[PDB]
């Protein structure tokens, strides 16, 4: 942890938007405008975008 910062850095409380394909699409910007971004909170991977 002295040299790298990721060893002692983690998120286990961040409430970041999670996309569920085909249920809540109208809450996020249309994917045809911006491609999905892959973000990592803890050890689960999923796409996210901006809210309308």
């Amino acid at each position: 942890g002295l040299l790298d910062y990721t060893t002692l850095e983690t998120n286990s409380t961040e409430l970041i938007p999670v996309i569920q394909s085909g249920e809540n699409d109208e809450q996020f910007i249309d994917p045809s405008v911006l491609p999905a971004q892959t973000v990592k909170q803890g050890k689960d991977t999923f796409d996210t975008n901006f809210l309308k």
């Binding site: 569920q20 249920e23 809540n24 809450q27």
Partner: protein
Amino acid sequence: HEFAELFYRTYIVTPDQAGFQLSIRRNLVWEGWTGEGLSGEKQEISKRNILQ
């Protein structure tokens, strides 16, 4: 007269503030929240006042 204060009890407030701020407490009884929105739509926690 008597009529004026009979319906509006006179309350003096210090001239240091632009008015008086009022706070009330409510006691409501919980039944259950109606609806989970997997489309991101709101939740309505069905609350009713106890004095009902």
